[PDB]
């Protein structure tokens, strides 16, 4: 089964860029689905915690040039 | 849910104005939308959790038509 987790992402001003990362997370192994707020600035993530953690989510946003953070 | 106003050019036929209709009002996160061809506006419910009137804007944009965030 998925857990969730809430990533939030500082930086975000376009369209554009929520879907590149929403894109590029979405492609990583264990990864179900993401859904980035850029009214919050932030995004869940439904995954698969065996395969896949927090801060490695967080660490993929942060390598796109966003400053990133586990929430909860 | 949010309420957006967003202006779009370039509605001149029925069949575009039901097209934007069921593209947009399709997408995860929207609630309603409603288009208006003698004003050139098309005013959506959405969920903010989910959606952004940046993005309802540039998916109007991507169909062909200019698209701008009013409020
Ligand atoms: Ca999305």
């Known amino acids: 089964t998925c857990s969730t987790t809430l990533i939030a992402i500082a930086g975000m ?4 860029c929520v879907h590149s ?10 990864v179900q689905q993401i859904s980035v707020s850029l009214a919050e600035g932030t995004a869940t993530v439904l995954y698969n915690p065996a395969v896949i953690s927090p801060e490695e989510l967080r660490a993929a946003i942060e390598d796109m040039g966003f400053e990133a953070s586990v929430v909860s």
């Open 13 to 16: 001003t376009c369209a554009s």
């Open 21 to 30: 990362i929403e894109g590029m997370i979405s492609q990583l192994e264990g």
